[PDB]
Structure 1
Amino acid sequence: GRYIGPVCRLCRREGVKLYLKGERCYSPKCAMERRPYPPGQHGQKRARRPSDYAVRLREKQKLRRIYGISERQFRNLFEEASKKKGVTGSVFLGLLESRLDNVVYRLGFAVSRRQARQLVRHGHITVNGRRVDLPSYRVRPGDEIAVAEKSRNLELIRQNLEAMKGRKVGPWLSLDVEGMKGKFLRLPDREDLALPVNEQLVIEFYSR
C-alpha cells in the first residue's frame, strides 16, 4: 500500500519541511524545527557535494512523498502528462493535484493526506452525490466533493471543518463550510501552487 512508516525521517533527508502531519508540523515539536539534518548515524556530518543524479533523485522523492503515492502510480501519471498536450511539468502537477485524496486534503476535510486517504477509503467522502472510496480518482473540473451526509456526525470531520472557516483556499476551489460541501472549479496554473519542488528537475530525472 502506501509508505505507511515513520514520516519525519522523510523531511530530514529532504532538507525541506514536507507537511505530512498537519497539526504537529506547525508545533515546535516538529522534527525539522529541532533537527534539520538527515536521519541515521551520519546526520551531523559535513555534506558531500551531491551529484547531478543525486539532485534529481531527491527532487523527485520530494514531489513523490508529498502526495503519498506509489512510485508506480506516480510514474504512470508523469508518463500520462508526457503523452498529454503542452507543458509536461504543469500538467503532471495538475494531474497530481487532481487526485481525490489530495483535493479532499486541500479543502481541509483532513489535516494530512494520510488522514484524507483514510477518509476516502473508509467511505466518508462523496463525489457529485454518490459515494467514492478510491484514493486515486482523477477529479475533473465541476465536482461537488462533500462529506458523507450519512457520516457528518463525526468529530474528526467536524473539528477539521470547524477550523476551516476563513482560510483562503485554492483559486481552483470553493468551500461550503458547516454544510460540509466542496467544489472543484478549475485545474491549476503554474503559479497557483507553491511547493518546494523544481518540477523541471523531475522531468530531467525520467529523461535519463
Structure 2
Amino acid sequence: GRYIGPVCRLCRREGVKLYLKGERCYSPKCAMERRPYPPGQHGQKRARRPSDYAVRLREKQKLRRIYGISERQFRNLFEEASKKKGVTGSVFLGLLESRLDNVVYRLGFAVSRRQARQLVRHGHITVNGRRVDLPSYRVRPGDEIAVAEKSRNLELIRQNLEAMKGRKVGPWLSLDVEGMKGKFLRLPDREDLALPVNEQLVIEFYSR
C-alpha cells in the first residue's frame, strides 16, 4: 500500500519535477508552475540550511517517490544491490529500472508509472508469452514485454500506442508498436537514465 494521495505535492516538496502523472506534468498544469515551493502553510517561507541528514533523506525520498515503491521494497532492493559484485549506486538504479511496472512505463504502454502498475496488476501485460500481474517482477535482458492478446482492444492501450508512433524508446529497450511488444535489451546505465538524483548521496543515507 504505497503512497496513494496527491502526487504533484511531492513534485512540490522535493522541489523538482518528478513525473508521476506522465502527461500534464508535461503541460503547464504540473503546479511546479506557480508553486515551486513545498506544500503547506509555511512552504512559502525562507528555507533553513538543511542538515546533512536532511539532504540525504530528501535525496533518497526523491529516488523513491520517482518509482512509487514502498520503503520496504526500496531498502530490500538496495541491500540486494550492495551484495552484488559491482558499483552499488548503478546496480541499484538498474534493479529499480527492471521492475515490470517501470519497464511498462518505459516502453510507452502506460502514460505514467502508476498507470503501468495498474495495467500490470490487471494482467494487460505479458512477459515472454505469459501474463505477469506483479509490478515487482524483475525483467531480465532478453525478456519480451507485450500488451496481452485481448487487452489490445482497450481504447487506453490503442491510445498510448498511437501516441508512441514516432517516439523513440530508451536505448536499453526496443519497441515494436505493430505487435504492441518490445524487448528489454540490457540493464540501463546510470548515464542511460536522466534521473535528477545523486545516488551516491542515497548510498550515504543507509551508511548511517
8 A Cα contact 1:162 1:178, kept in partner: no
Partner residue in 2 for 1:178: 178
8 A Cα contact 1:2 1:69, kept in partner: yes
Give me the whole-angstrom Cα distance separating, in 1, the residues matched to 2:30 and 2:65: 17
How far residue 2 of structure 1 moved from its aligned partner, in angstroms, is 2.0
Tell me the TM-score normalized by structure 1: 0.98
Tell me the TM-score normalized by structure 2: 0.98
Question: What secondary structure, in the 3-state scheme, does the structure 2 residue paired with 1:61 have?
Answer: helix
How far residue 27 of structure 1 moved from its aligned partner, in angstroms, is 1.4
Partner residue in 1 for 2:157: 157
Partner residue in 2 for 1:131: 131
Spell out, residue by residue over 1:91-138, the C-alpha distance to the aligned partner (whole angstroms, 9 max, x if none): 000000000000000001011110000000011000000100000001
Give me the whole-angstrom Cα distance separating, in 2, the residues matched to 1:207 and 1:44: 32
Give me the whole-angstrom Cα distance separating, in 2, the residues matched to 1:167 and 1:197: 25
Partner residue in 1 for 2:197: 197
**What is the total number of aligned residue pairs between the two structures?**
208
List structure 1 runs of 4+ shifted beyond 4 angstroms: none
Give me the whole-angstrom Cα distance separating, in 1, the residues matched to 2:191 and 2:134: 28
Spell out, residue by residue over 1:45-94, the C-alpha distance to the aligned partner (whole angstroms, 9 max, x if none): 01101110000000000000000000000000000000011100000000
Q: Percent identity?
A: 100
Q: Which moved more, 1:60-69 or 1:1-10?
A: 1-10
Question: What secondary structure, in the 3-state scheme, does the structure 1 residue paired with 2:111 have?
Answer: coil
How far residue 178 of structure 1 moved from its aligned partner, in angstroms, is 3.0
Spell out, residue by residue over 1:158-190, the C-alpha distance to the aligned partner (whole angstroms, 9 max, x if none): 100001111221111000013201110100122
Structure 1: state its 5+ residue gaps. none
Structure 2: state its 5+ residue gaps. none
8 A Cα contact 1:161 1:178, kept in partner: no
8 A Cα contact 1:28 1:34, kept in partner: no
Computed over aligned residues only, the root mean square deviation of the Cα atoms, in angstroms, reads 0.7
